Write an enzyme that holds these catalytic residues in place. Structure first.
Site, mmCIF file in Angstrom:
data_model
loop_
_atom_site.group_PDB
_atom_site.id
_atom_site.type_symbol
_atom_site.label_atom_id
_atom_site.label_comp_id
_atom_site.label_asym_id
_atom_site.label_seq_id
_atom_site.Cartn_x
_atom_site.Cartn_y
_atom_site.Cartn_z
ATOM 1 N N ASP A 1 -6.632 -0.396 6.407
ATOM 2 C CA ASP A 1 -5.583 -0.038 5.433
ATOM 3 C C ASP A 1 -6.007 -0.340 3.985
ATOM 4 O O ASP A 1 -5.389 -1.179 3.331
ATOM 5 C CB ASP A 1 -4.232 -0.688 5.765
ATOM 6 C CG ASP A 1 -3.062 -0.160 4.880
ATOM 7 O OD1 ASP A 1 -3.131 0.893 4.149
ATOM 8 O OD2 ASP A 1 -2.048 -0.789 4.969
ATOM 9 N N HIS B 1 -1.590 3.217 2.483
ATOM 10 C CA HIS B 1 -0.289 3.867 2.394
ATOM 11 C C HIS B 1 0.362 3.932 1.002
ATOM 12 O O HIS B 1 1.456 4.515 0.823
ATOM 13 C CB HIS B 1 0.643 3.372 3.484
ATOM 14 C CG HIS B 1 -0.007 3.388 4.827
ATOM 15 N ND1 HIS B 1 -0.666 4.505 5.319
ATOM 16 C CD2 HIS B 1 -0.187 2.410 5.748
ATOM 17 C CE1 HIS B 1 -1.165 4.222 6.511
ATOM 18 N NE2 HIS B 1 -0.878 2.966 6.800
ATOM 19 N N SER C 1 1.990 -4.748 -1.426
ATOM 20 C CA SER C 1 0.918 -4.030 -0.634
ATOM 21 C C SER C 1 -0.195 -3.709 -1.575
ATOM 22 O O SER C 1 0.082 -3.268 -2.710
ATOM 23 C CB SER C 1 1.280 -2.590 -0.214
ATOM 24 O OG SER C 1 2.621 -2.349 -0.164
HETATM 25 N N1 LIG Z 1 3.165 -6.157 3.374
HETATM 26 C C1 LIG Z 1 4.523 -5.984 3.464
HETATM 27 O O1 LIG Z 1 5.191 -6.941 3.922
HETATM 28 N N2 LIG Z 1 4.995 -4.755 3.159
HETATM 29 C C2 LIG Z 1 4.192 -3.670 2.662
HETATM 30 C C3 LIG Z 1 5.006 -2.595 2.461
HETATM 31 N N3 LIG Z 1 4.686 -1.339 1.935
HETATM 32 C C4 LIG Z 1 4.942 -0.907 0.699
HETATM 33 O O2 LIG Z 1 5.484 -1.682 -0.152
HETATM 34 N N4 LIG Z 1 4.613 0.382 0.286
HETATM 35 C C5 LIG Z 1 4.005 1.421 1.113
HETATM 36 C C6 LIG Z 1 4.314 2.677 0.256
HETATM 37 N N5 LIG Z 1 5.666 3.241 0.411
HETATM 38 C C7 LIG Z 1 4.166 2.172 -1.211
HETATM 39 C C8 LIG Z 1 4.846 0.765 -1.085
HETATM 40 C C9 LIG Z 1 6.280 0.737 -1.510
HETATM 41 O O3 LIG Z 1 7.166 0.869 -0.688
HETATM 42 N N6 LIG Z 1 6.391 0.385 -2.810
HETATM 43 C C10 LIG Z 1 7.553 0.274 -3.529
HETATM 44 C C11 LIG Z 1 8.650 1.098 -3.246
HETATM 45 C C12 LIG Z 1 9.802 0.984 -4.025
HETATM 46 C C13 LIG Z 1 9.828 0.077 -5.066
HETATM 47 C C14 LIG Z 1 8.711 -0.730 -5.351
HETATM 48 O O4 LIG Z 1 8.692 -1.614 -6.436
HETATM 49 C C15 LIG Z 1 9.155 -2.928 -6.190
HETATM 50 F F1 LIG Z 1 8.376 -3.499 -5.270
HETATM 51 F F2 LIG Z 1 10.396 -2.809 -5.637
HETATM 52 F F3 LIG Z 1 9.085 -3.624 -7.364
HETATM 53 C C16 LIG Z 1 7.566 -0.649 -4.580
HETATM 54 C C17 LIG Z 1 6.437 -3.039 2.831
HETATM 55 C C18 LIG Z 1 7.680 -2.387 2.862
HETATM 56 C C19 LIG Z 1 8.842 -3.075 3.310
HETATM 57 C C20 LIG Z 1 8.749 -4.415 3.767
HETATM 58 C C21 LIG Z 1 7.490 -5.074 3.765
HETATM 59 C C22 LIG Z 1 6.332 -4.358 3.274
#
Ligand SMILES: NC(=O)n1cc(NC(=O)N2C[C@@H](N)C[C@H]2C(=O)Nc2cccc(OC(F)(F)F)c2)c2ccccc21
Length: 216
Positions: free
Chosen positions: A85, A41, A169
């Site tokens: 994933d 993702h 992630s």
């Molecule tokens: N493994 C996890 O626990 N998690 C894995 C998640 N997924 C992601 O982080 N994703 C999937 C996709 N959109 C890509 C990613 C993303 O959202 N990245 C992202 C978005 C905004 C800012 C950011 O930089 C910082 F982390 F804030 F430094 C990273 C996620 C989102 C919210 C809460 C837990 C989460």
């Protein structure tokens, strides 16, 4: 990374920041000279990969940014599941390798990590629930759960306040110096003990990872 600490600079030379529009999106793990393993993702626009970094914004000689020649989502990945994933990203050219930038070996034997083993997960993911973004690489050691508590291609680690979270992630979960897990990329509550961290077991995908490294 929640409840972690700042990593030692370049001490995890396989760590990649997978970036979009010049901003950290996800973690990655350098798994070969020209390949970075992340989660699916993250791909979901113009993808770039930063190697050799500790600080995302400050000058460091070992910092190199790379474009991506090909992105290879696992073919069974779907946008609404955390199944399969994984994403393989092929760098525009071979990584300039060195003490700050070096592939990590990855588990090819399909056997679970022993429960209670502390594994290391690192990322530039958020460091609190307000979304604070760290400039420098963070990490934390986490106890791997038995599968019965986590409840076959997934593994869990304790999420009691220490945890992987948003923006971690695609990053590594490393046990006894070998890549065992990749942080899943689906939304989830973070730092809640009753809701463990979920990680994709690379050993499960050994044939697909070799195949992709082999069509090069
Ligand atoms: N493994 C996890 O626990 N998690 C894995 C998640 N997924 C992601 O982080 N994703 C999937 C996709 N959109 C890509 C990613 C993303 O959202 N990245 C992202 C978005 C905004 C800012 C950011 O930089 C910082 F982390 F804030 F430094 C990273 C996620 C989102 C919210 C809460 C837990 C989460």
């Amino acid at each position: 990374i929640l409840g972690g600490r700042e990593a030692e600079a370049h001490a995890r030379p396989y760590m990649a920041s997978v970036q979009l529009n010049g901003a950290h999106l996800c973690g990655g793990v350098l798994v070969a000279e020209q390949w970075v393993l992340s989660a699916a993702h993250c791909l979901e626009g113009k993808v770039q990969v930063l190697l050799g970094a500790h600080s995302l914004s400050q000058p460091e000689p070992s910092k190199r940014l790379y474009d991506v020649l090909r992105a290879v989502p696992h073919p069974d990945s779907q946008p609404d599941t955390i199944d399969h994933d994984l994403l393989l990203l092929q760098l525009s050219e071979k990584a300039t390798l060195g003490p700050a930038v070096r592939p990590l070996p990855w588990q090819r034997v399909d056997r679970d990590v022993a429960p209670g083993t502390l594994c290391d997960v690192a990322g530039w993911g958020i460091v609190n629930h307000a979304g604070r973004r760290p400039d420098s690489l963070q990490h934390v050691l986490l106890p791997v759960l038995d599968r019965a508590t986590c409840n076959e291609r997934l593994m869990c680690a304790e999420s009691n306040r220490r945890d992987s979270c948003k923006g971690d992630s695609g990053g590594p979960l490393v046990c006894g110096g070998v890549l065992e897990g990749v942080v899943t990329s689906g939304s989830r509550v973070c730092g809640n003990r009753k809701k463990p961290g979920i990680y994709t077991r690379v050993a499960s995908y050994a044939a697909w990872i070799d195949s992709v490294l082999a069509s090069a």
